[PDB]
Amino acid sequence: LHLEQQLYSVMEDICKLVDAIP
Amino acid sequence: VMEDICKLVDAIPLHELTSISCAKELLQQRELRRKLLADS
């Protein structure tokens, strides 16, 4: 199940992106 | 989890998405988190 680990850190790049108005 | 946030990021309209400069690359995170969810 290499697809769950791939979604664990690919929608974690969308979040850190949300962080960049600090 | 943390992605009830990203639930709100797949919802920003395409007209309202041009006002942020990170969107060139952080909208391919939207269209890729949707092909991977679809691989059930």
Protein described:
The structure is a homodimer. Chain A has 22 residues and is mostly helical. The first copy, chain A, has 2 helices and no strands. The first copy, chain A, has helices at residues 2-8, 12-19. It is classed as transferase. Keywords: helicase dimerization alpha-helix motif, transferase. It forms a dimeric assembly.
SSE topology:
The structure is a homodimer.
Chain A: H1 2-8, H2 12-19
Subunit structure (chain A): Monomer. Homodimer (via N-terminus). Homotetramer (via N-terminus); dimer of dimers. Homohexamer (via N-terminus). Self-association negatively regulates DNA unwinding amplitude and rate. Oligomer complexes dissociate into monomer in presence of ATP.
Family (chain A): Belongs to the helicase family. RecQ subfamily.
Protein name (chain A): RecQ-like DNA helicase BLM
The helix-strand sequence of chain A is HH
Largest sheet of chain A: none
Shape of chain A: rod-shaped
Number of helices of chain A: 2
- Report the sheet-strand fraction of chain A: under 5%
Chain oligomer state: homodimer
Query: Which pair has the most extensive contact?
Result: A-B, 12 and 14 residues
PDB class: transferase
Keywords: helicase dimerization alpha-helix motif, transferase
Assembly: dimeric
Entry title: Structures of DHBN domain of Gallus gallus BLM helicase
